[PDB]
Amino acid sequence: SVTGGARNFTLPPRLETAIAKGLRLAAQRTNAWVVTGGTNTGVMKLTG
Amino acid sequence: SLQESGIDEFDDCILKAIFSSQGKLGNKLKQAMYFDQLDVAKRALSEASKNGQHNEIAACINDNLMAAMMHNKPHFVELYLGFDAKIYELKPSEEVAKTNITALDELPSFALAIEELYKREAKKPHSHVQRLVSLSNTDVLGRHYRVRDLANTRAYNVLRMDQIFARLVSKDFSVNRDFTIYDSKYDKVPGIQFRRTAQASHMLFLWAICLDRFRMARHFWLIGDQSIINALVASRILERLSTHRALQGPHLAEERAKMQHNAKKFEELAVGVLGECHGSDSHMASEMLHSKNDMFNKKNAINIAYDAKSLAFLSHPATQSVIN
Amino acid sequence: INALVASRILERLSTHRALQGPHLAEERAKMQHNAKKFEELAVGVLGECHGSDSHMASEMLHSKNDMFNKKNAINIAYDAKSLAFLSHPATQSVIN
Amino acid sequence: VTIVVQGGPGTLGTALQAVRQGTPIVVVDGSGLAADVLAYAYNFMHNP
Amino acid sequence: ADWYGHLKSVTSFWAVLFAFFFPFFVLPFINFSGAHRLRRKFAKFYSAPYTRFISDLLSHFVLCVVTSYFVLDKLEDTISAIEWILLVWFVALLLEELRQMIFCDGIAEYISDTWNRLDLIMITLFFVGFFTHASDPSNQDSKVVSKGIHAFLVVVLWLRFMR
Amino acid sequence: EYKDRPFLPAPFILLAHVHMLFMRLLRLCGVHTQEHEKIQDDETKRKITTFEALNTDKFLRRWERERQEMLEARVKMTNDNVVQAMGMMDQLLEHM
Amino acid sequence: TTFEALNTDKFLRRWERERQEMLEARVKMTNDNVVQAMGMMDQLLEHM
Amino acid sequence: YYALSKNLGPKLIMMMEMMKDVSTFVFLLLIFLIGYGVAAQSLLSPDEDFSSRTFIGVLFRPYFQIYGELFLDDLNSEANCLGDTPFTECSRETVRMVPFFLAVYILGSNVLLVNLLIAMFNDTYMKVQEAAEDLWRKQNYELCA
Amino acid sequence: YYALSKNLGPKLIMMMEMMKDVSTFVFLLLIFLIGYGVAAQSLLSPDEDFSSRTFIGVLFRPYFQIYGELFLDDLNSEANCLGDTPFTECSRETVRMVPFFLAVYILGSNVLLVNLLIAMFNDTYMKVQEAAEDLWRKQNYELCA
Numbered sequence A: 001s002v003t004g005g006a007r008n009f010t011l012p013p014r015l016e017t018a019i020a021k022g023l024r025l026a027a028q029r030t031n032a033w034v035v036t037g038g039t040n041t042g043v044m045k046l047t048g
Numbered sequence B: 001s002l003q004e005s006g007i008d009e010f011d012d013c014i015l016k017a018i019f020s021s022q023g024k025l026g027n028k029l030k031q032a033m034y035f036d037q038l039d040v041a042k043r044a045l046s047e048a049s050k051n052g053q054h055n056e057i058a059a060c061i062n063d064n065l066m067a068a069m070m071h072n073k074p075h076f077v078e079l080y081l082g083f084d085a086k087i088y089e090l091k092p093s094e095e096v097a098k099t100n101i102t103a104l105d106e107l108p109s110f111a112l113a114i115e116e117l118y119k120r121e122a123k124k125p126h127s128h129v130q131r132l133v134s135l136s137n138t139d140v141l142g143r144h145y146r147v148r149d150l151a152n153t154r155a156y157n158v159l160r161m162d163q164i165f166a167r168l169v170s171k172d173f174s175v176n177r178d179f180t181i182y183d184s185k186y187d188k189v190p191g192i193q194f195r196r197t198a199q200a201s202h203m204l205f206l207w208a209i210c211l212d213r214f215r216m217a218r219h220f221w222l223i224g225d226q227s228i229i230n231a232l233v234a235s236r237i238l239e240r241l242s243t244h245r246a247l248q249g250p251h252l253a254e255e256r257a258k259m260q261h262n263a264k265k266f267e268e269l270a271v272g273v274l275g276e277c278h279g280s281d282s283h284m285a286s287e288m289l290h291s292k293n294d295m296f297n298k299k300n301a302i303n304i305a306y307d308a309k310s311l312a313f314l315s316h317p318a319t320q321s322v323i324n
Numbered sequence C: 001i002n003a004l005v006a007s008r009i010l011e012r013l014s015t016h017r018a019l020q021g022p023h024l025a026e027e028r029a030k031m032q033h034n035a036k037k038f039e040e041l042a043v044g045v046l047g048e049c050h051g052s053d054s055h056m057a058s059e060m061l062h063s064k065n066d067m068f069n070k071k072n073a074i075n076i077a078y079d080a081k082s083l084a085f086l087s088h089p090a091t092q093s094v095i096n
Numbered sequence D: 001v002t003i004v005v006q007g008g009p010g011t012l013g014t015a016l017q018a019v020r021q022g023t024p025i026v027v028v029d030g031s032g033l034a035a036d037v038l039a040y041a042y043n044f045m046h047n048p
Numbered sequence E: 001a002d003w004y005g006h007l008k009s010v011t012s013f014w015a016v017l018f019a020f021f022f023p024f025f026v027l028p029f030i031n032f033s034g035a036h037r038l039r040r041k042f043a044k045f046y047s048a049p050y051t052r053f054i055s056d057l058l059s060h061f062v063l064c065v066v067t068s069y070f071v072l073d074k075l076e077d078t079i080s081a082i083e084w085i086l087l088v089w090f091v092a093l094l095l096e097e098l099r100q101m102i103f104c105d106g107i108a109e110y111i112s113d114t115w116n117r118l119d120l121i122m123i124t125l126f127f128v129g130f131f132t133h134a135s136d137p138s139n140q141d142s143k144v145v146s147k148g149i150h151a152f153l154v155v156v157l158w159l160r161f162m163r
Numbered sequence F: 001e002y003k004d005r006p007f008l009p010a011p012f013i014l015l016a017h018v019h020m021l022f023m024r025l026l027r028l029c030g031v032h033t034q035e036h037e038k039i040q041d042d043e044t045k046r047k048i049t050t051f052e053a054l055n056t057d058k059f060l061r062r063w064e065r066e067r068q069e070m071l072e073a074r075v076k077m078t079n080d081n082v083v084q085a086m087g088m089m090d091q092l093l094e095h096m
Numbered sequence G: 001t002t003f004e005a006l007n008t009d010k011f012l013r014r015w016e017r018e019r020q021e022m023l024e025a026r027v028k029m030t031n032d033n034v035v036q037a038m039g040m041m042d043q044l045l046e047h048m
Numbered sequence H, I: 001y002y003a004l005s006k007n008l009g010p011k012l013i014m015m016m017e018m019m020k021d022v023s024t025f026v027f028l029l030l031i032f033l034i035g036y037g038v039a040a041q042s043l044l045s046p047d048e049d050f051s052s053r054t055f056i057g058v059l060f061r062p063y064f065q066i067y068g069e070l071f072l073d074d075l076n077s078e079a080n081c082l083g084d085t086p087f088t089e090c091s092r093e094t095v096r097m098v099p100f101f102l103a104v105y106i107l108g109s110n111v112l113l114v115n116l117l118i119a120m121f122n123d124t125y126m127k128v129q130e131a132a133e134d135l136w137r138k139q140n141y142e143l144c145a
C-alpha cells in the first residue's frame, strides 16, 4: 500500500528517482499488489 | 532515512517491516527469498528455533523449498536443510491429470513437483531441455522407438528423463526406482527416513544435473549416498550433455564449455573422496574399488569411470594400486 | 654436511627399488621436493658464509670431515649430486 | 506494507487506520511534509 | 538463424548434399521449423543460403573438374562443344560478377575482397585464352599459346576453389 | 555473400538473370504488379530502446559489482577503512 | 558405505579448510570484518 | 605392445592426433598439387590425348617435388629443350615457364605448407605432452582389461 | 675439451639427452622401415630366393629415402618398367604400387616422425636450457677433479 499527498507533492528529481528506483526494484522483485489512491495527481500518478 | 542511508537498505527496511508482522511465515520467508537476504532470514529462523516454535516452520519450509527450487536459490536450500527439511514431502503448484497408467499412478506427489520444475525449466525460449526431448524421439514411459495429449502434457515426467539419462550414460545403466517405500505403513523400520530422502535427493540431483546448477547438485550429492558413483555419473551425463546433438551450433559453445567446466568439478570431487580414501585404510579403499554396484549391471567403479571416460580418476594412486 | 646427507638419502629414497610403481609416483615426487628443500638449506648456510668472512668459508670448504673417509664437502656434494651447492659463488671461488 | 511518502491530514488518517488495524508502516524521513512529523514522533518516542 | 533459415539446426553435410542431389528424397525428411505443404517444403529448403553455398561449391567443383579435362586433353581443329559450354558458363559468371557489381555497397567494397579480384582475373584470362584459340583455330602454335594461358586459368581456378 | 545469390548454379544462373531482368522490366518500372515493403512500429522500437536502457543499467550495476569484486579495490577499501578506523579510534581515545 | 560417508565428510571439511586458506576468501573476510569493526566502533562512539 | 613403456605409449596417441593434422595438410595440399599438375602436364605435353598416363603425370611429379627430389633433368628431357643451359633453345616457348610455375609451387608447398605443419605439430605435441601420463595410465588399464 | 667454454659444455649434455630421443625415434622408425622394406622388396622382386642381398634390400633404400634421396630412377630401373612416363607400361602390374607404398611411407616418416623429433628436441632443449649453467659449473669441477 502506497499513501501520500495528492496535490501537494513537490520533491527534488534526485530523491524522486531514488524513491522510484527503490519502488521499481521492490515491485519487480516482490510481485506485489499495490494499493494507492485512485486519482491522477502526485505520488499515485508516480506509482502508476 | 532517504539521504542518510544507502540505496540498498530500502529492501532491508521493507523486509524488516515484513518481519514486523507476525503470522505469515511462509510468505515472509518467500519475500526473504525474493529480497535475497540470507542472514536476516537465518536470524529469523534462529530466533524462531530459540523461542521454541517448530510447527509453523514445518508448515512453511516445504513450500519454501518448492519456491526456492523453482526460483533458483542454492544458499536457501542449503540453509533450510538441517532444520528437519523433509525433501520427500514436497507438493506441486497444480494438479496432474489422470493418464491411465499404472506406473504413473504410483508416483508419490513430489515427482509431479519435479515434473513441474521441468515444465518451468522448459518454458523458457531457446532451452536445451525442450530440444533434447524433441531430439530424444521416445515414448512417455521412456521406451526407445515408440513415437498424443498424454505424451504432450506429461512430456517432462521423471521416468522419461530417467530413461534419457539411462541412455545418456551407456547402453547398460538400468536405473531402479521403488515408489512403494513412500507410504505410511513402512514407518516402524528405523533407517527408512535415511532412504526416503536419499533416493529422492538423487531425483532432484538428476534435475540439478539437467539444468547446469552446480551448487544444488553438490548439496543433493551431499545429502544422498554413493558419492563416488554419482559423481562419475554426473561427469558422464555432463560430458554427454556437452555434445549431444542439439548443442552443436556456434551460439551455444561457451555454454557447452561451461558443461565441460562443471564436468571437471565433479570428477575432481570423485578424486577427492578417493583422496580421503587414500588418506586412511587403503586396503578398505581397494575393497571399495573392487566392490560391485547395484546401479549398473554388476561392474565396479573403475569400469564405471572408463565408461565415463574420466582421466583424473584413472590417474589416482589408489586406482593405479588396484590396476597394478 | 647433514643437509647434503639429507639430500642424498632423499634422492636415493626417491628411486631405491621399491618406489618404482605408478601408485607411489607423487609420493616419490614428494621425496624430490623435500630433497630440494634441504639442498636449498645447504646453499643458504653457505649464503650466510658468503655474507661474511669468505676466506673462513674457503677454509671451511677445504676442511676435512670425520664423518666420511677424509673428503671435504664439495666431494660430499658431488657424491650427493647436488647442482645448487656446486653453483654457489663460494664453492666456485674454491674451484676457481 | 504501507509506505508514507510526504503527505497531509488524510495520509495521517490512512497511517492511523494502518496502525490501528495492525498493518506495519514504512515512513521515509527527509522526504517532506507529514513523513517528517511521523519520523520526528517515532524518533522522539522510541529512538535511544 | 539467417544461415540455416527454415531448416532448424540438425543437418549434416551429407544430408543436405543427398537432399540436393535427390529432390524426391527431401520430402521424407520431416519439415524442420496438399500441394502447398510439399511445395513450401522445397521452397523453404531451396530458399536457404546454405543450399546456395552447397550449390556454388558443387557447381564450381564441376567447373574445375570439367576444365581439368578440357586443359589436359588435346584441342581440336575446330571449336569443341565443351569449349562452348565453358564459354556460356563463364558468360553466366560474368553476368554474376556484374550482378555483384551493381548490387553491392560500393565499388571499393566489392574490390576490397581478394576473391572478387581473383574471379575477375580468371574471367579476364579465360576470355584472353578463348580469343587466342578462336582467333585462328587451325594452327598448332595458337593452341600452344592458348594452353599456356589456360594453365594460368586452371591455377587461379584451383586458387579460387579455396573460398 | 550467399544471402543475395539467386540459388541456380553457374551454368543455369543466366536463366535466373533473365528472370531477374524480367522482374526488373516488370516491377520498379512500368506495368508493375506488386512491391513489398515493411516498416517497424513506433511502440515496438520504443520497447527496444527502453529494453536497451534497462539492460545498460543492469550491465553497469553488474560491472560495478564485478569491479568491486576484484582484489585491488578490496585491498584499497580495506586500507582506507583501516585508516578511517584509526581516525574514529583517535576520536575514542580523545573522548576517553 | 559408512567408510565412504565418513571420508566424504572428512574431504568436505578438509576442502572447506583449504577453501578458506586461499587468498581471495582471506581478503574478503578481512574486508567484511573491518566493516563490522567500523560498525562496532560507531556503536562505541555513540556510547561515548 | 609399446603401451607398457612410459615413453612410446603417449607417442602413439600423439601419432594419431598428428595424423588428423596430416589429413588437414592433405586437404590443404591437394589444391596446389592438382593445380600445378594440370598446368605442368598441359605445358609439357600439348596436342596429346587424355588417358591414364596423363593422370599419372598429374599425380606423380607434383607429389614428389615437395620432398626435395626435383626432377629438373627429367623435366629437361621431357620438354625436349637442347642446350648447355637447360632452358634456352627449346622448340616451343611455353615450356620455359615449366621451372617458373615450379618455383611458385615450391613456394606454395616446400617452404609454406610444410612449415605450417611444423607449427600444427608443435601445438599438437604441446596438447598431448601436457596430459601424457593420464593417457599412459589409461592404456595401462586397457592392457589390464 | 669443449667443457671449458660456457657454450659448448651444456651442448654436450644436450647432445646426450638428445641421443636418448634419437633411440626413441629408432624404436618408432624401425616398424615403418622394416614394414615398407619387406613390402617393397617383395613387390620389386617376385619369385626370388632369400639371401643376404634381400636383407640389404630391406635395409638400404627405406633408410635413405627418409632423408630426401628418393631413388625413383633406380626404382624405375629395378622394376624394369619401360616408358617416358616411369610407371605405365610395366611387365607386371604389382610394381605400380611401388611409388604408392613409398607415398604412404614418406607420409609415415619424412613429414610425420621427423617433425615429432623436432618437437621432442624442442622440449629436450628447453629442459636442458633452463638448467645449463649448473651443468657447466659441475663439468668445471669435473675438469678440476
Ligand SMILES: Nc1ncnc2c1ncn2[C@@H]1O[C@H](COP(=O)(O)OP(=O)(O)OC[C@H]2O[C@@H](O)[C@H](O)[C@@H]2O)[C@@H](O)[C@H]1O
Residues within 6 Å of the ligand: A002, A003, A004, A005, A006, A007, A008, A009, A036, A037, A038, A039, A041, D007, D008, D009, D010, D011, D012, D014
Ligand atoms: N486523493 C486525493 N486526490 C485529490 N485531491 C485530494 C485527495 N485527498 C485530498 N485532496 C485535496 O487536495 C489537497 C492536497 O492535499 P494533500 O496533502 O496533497 O493530500 P492529502 O490531504 O494527504 O490526501 C491524502 C489521501 O491520499 C491518499 O494517499 C490517501 O488515501 C489519502 O486519502 C487537500 O487539501 C485535499 O483537500
Ligand SMILES: CC(C)CCC[C@@H](C)[C@H]1CC[C@H]2[C@@H]3CC=C4C[C@@H](O)CC[C@]4(C)[C@H]3CC[C@]12C
Residues within 6 Å of the ligand: E125, E145, E148, E149, E152, H093, H094
Ligand atoms: C598478370 C599476369 C598473371 C598475366 C599472366 C601472364 C600470362 C597469361 C602471359 C603473359 C606473357 C605471356 C607470354 C609472352 C610471350 C610468349 C612468347 C610466345 O612465342 C609464346 C607465348 C608466350 C610464352 C606468352 C604466354 C602467355 C604469357 C606468359
Ligand SMILES: CC(C)CCC[C@@H](C)[C@H]1CC[C@H]2[C@@H]3CC=C4C[C@@H](O)CC[C@]4(C)[C@H]3CC[C@]12C
Residues within 6 Å of the ligand: H025, H026, H027, H029, H030, H033, H056, H059, H060, H063, I087, I088, I096, I097, I099, I100, I103
Ligand atoms: C595430399 C597428398 C598426400 C596427395 C596424395 C598422393 C596420392 C593421391 C598420389 C601421389 C602419388 C601417386 C602415385 C604416383 C604413381 C603411381 C604409379 C602409376 O602406375 C599408378 C598410380 C600411382 C600409384 C599414383 C597413385 C596416387 C598417388 C599415391
Ligand SMILES: CC(C)CCC[C@@H](C)[C@H]1CC[C@H]2[C@@H]3CC=C4C[C@@H](O)CC[C@]4(C)[C@H]3CC[C@]12C
Residues within 6 Å of the ligand: H093, H094, H096, H097, H100
Ligand atoms: C603475379 C605473377 C604471377 C607474375 C607473373 C610473371 C609472368 C608475367 C612472367 C614471369 C616469367 C616470365 C617468362 C620468363 C621468360 C620467358 C622466355 C621468353 O622467351 C618467352 C616469355 C617467357 C616464357 C616469360 C613469360 C612471362 C613470365 C611467365
Ligand SMILES: CC(C)CCC[C@@H](C)[C@H]1CC[C@H]2[C@@H]3CC=C4C[C@@H](O)CC[C@]4(C)[C@H]3CC[C@]12C
Residues within 6 Å of the ligand: I025, I026, I027, I029, I030, I033, I056, I059, I060, I063
Ligand atoms: C631406425 C633406423 C636408424 C634404422 C637403423 C639403420 C640400420 C639398421 C641399417 C640402415 C642402412 C643399413 C646398411 C645399408 C647398406 C649396407 C651395405 C651392405 O653391403 C651390408 C649392410 C649395410 C652396411 C647395412 C647395415 C645396416 C644399416 C646401417
Ligand SMILES: CC(C)CCC[C@@H](C)[C@H]1CC[C@H]2[C@@H]3CC=C4C[C@@H](O)CC[C@]4(C)[C@H]3CC[C@]12C
Residues within 6 Å of the ligand: I093, I094
Ligand atoms: C581396403 C584396402 C586396403 C584394400 C587393399 C587393396 C589391395 C589388397 C588390392 C585392392 C586392388 C588390388 C589390385 C586390383 C587389380 C590388379 C591388377 C592385376 O592385373 C594385378 C593385381 C592388382 C594390381 C591388384 C593387387 C591387389 C590390390 C591392390
Ligand SMILES: CC(C)CCC[C@@H](C)[C@H]1CC[C@H]2[C@@H]3CC=C4C[C@@H](O)CC[C@]4(C)[C@H]3CC[C@]12C
Residues within 6 Å of the ligand: I093, I094, I096, I097, I100
Ligand atoms: C586405405 C588406403 C590404403 C587405400 C588403398 C588404395 C588402393 C586400394 C589403391 C590406391 C592406388 C591403387 C593402384 C593405382 C593404379 C594401379 C594400376 C592399374 O593398372 C592396376 C591397379 C593399380 C596398381 C591400383 C591398385 C589399387 C590401389 C593400390
Ligand SMILES: [Mg+2]
Residues within 6 Å of the ligand: E097, E100, E115, E116, E119
Ligand atoms: Mg563473386
